[PDB]
Amino acid sequence: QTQKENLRKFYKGKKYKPLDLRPKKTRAMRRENLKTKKQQRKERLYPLRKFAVKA
């Protein structure tokens, strides 16, 4: 435990680290909010409105 905590402090901040020091969630999980300028402009010009009926 002491060795591995020292190793994790050592490799913190490095782009590439040993595989055992990389998170292991699930092969599928290791393999989103980017929008095109077109979609951003569409959202800005036509946002969803809050409305009520029969008033």
Partner 1 sequence: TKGTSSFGKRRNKTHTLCRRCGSKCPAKRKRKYNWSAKAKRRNTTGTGRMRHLKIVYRRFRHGFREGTTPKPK
Residues near RNA (CB under 7 A) are: 1, 8, 15, 17, 19-20, 22-28, 30, 32, 36-38, 41-42
Residue type, 14: K
Q: Which two tokens stand for residue 30?
A: 């290791």
Q: From 11-19, 22-30, 36-44, 46-54, give the range in contact with partner 1 by CB under 8 A.
A: 22-30
Cβ neighbours of 21 (radius 10 Å): 13
Q: Which two tokens stand for residue 35?
A: 């929008």
Q: Which does 50 bind (CB under 5 to 8 A by kind): RNA, partner 1, none?
A: none
Q: For the chain, what's the residue count?
A: 55
Q: Of 19, 29, 34, 55, which one interacts with partner 1 (CB under 8 A)?
A: 29
